[PDB]
Amino acid sequence: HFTPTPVSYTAGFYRIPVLGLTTRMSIYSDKSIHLSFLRTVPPYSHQSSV
Amino acid sequence: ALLAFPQSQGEMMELDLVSLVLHIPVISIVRHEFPRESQNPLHLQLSLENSL
Numbered sequence A: 001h002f003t004p005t006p007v008s009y010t011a012g013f014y015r016i017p018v019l020g021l022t023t024r025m026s027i028y029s030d031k032s033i034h035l036s037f038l039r040t041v042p043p044y045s046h047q048s049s050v
Numbered sequence B: 001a002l003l004a005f006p007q008s009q010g011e012m013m014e015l016d017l018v019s020l021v022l023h024i025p026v027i028s029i030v031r032h033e034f035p036r037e038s039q040n041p042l043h044l045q046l047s048l049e050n051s052l
Helices: A004-013 A044-049 B009-022
Strands: B002-004 B026-030 B043-047
Touching: B002 B009, B009 B026, B009 B043
Parallel strands: B002 B026, B026 B043
Antiparallel strands: none
16 A cells, blocks of 8 residues: 555645556545545445445 | 644645655644645644634
């Protein structure tokens, strides 16, 4: 959990959205941390409702 | 830990930049309730005046 953290730290503060192709974790999905971040694929948490 | 005494938004942004560069605990004081998008858990910002 290193590359997603720096990626969200840099672009998130600039209000520059970032699309996460290889991110299946909802940790950076609080709508507060990484306010400018997009998920190309859902995390496993959604699969929990499955 | 570090202590910050910001008096402007730019000061808070610069402090957040330096803190993320350091990734360490830093204390900052805001004259009121300051909603800051900087979500680094290592930064502790205290509103000087409580909400009325």
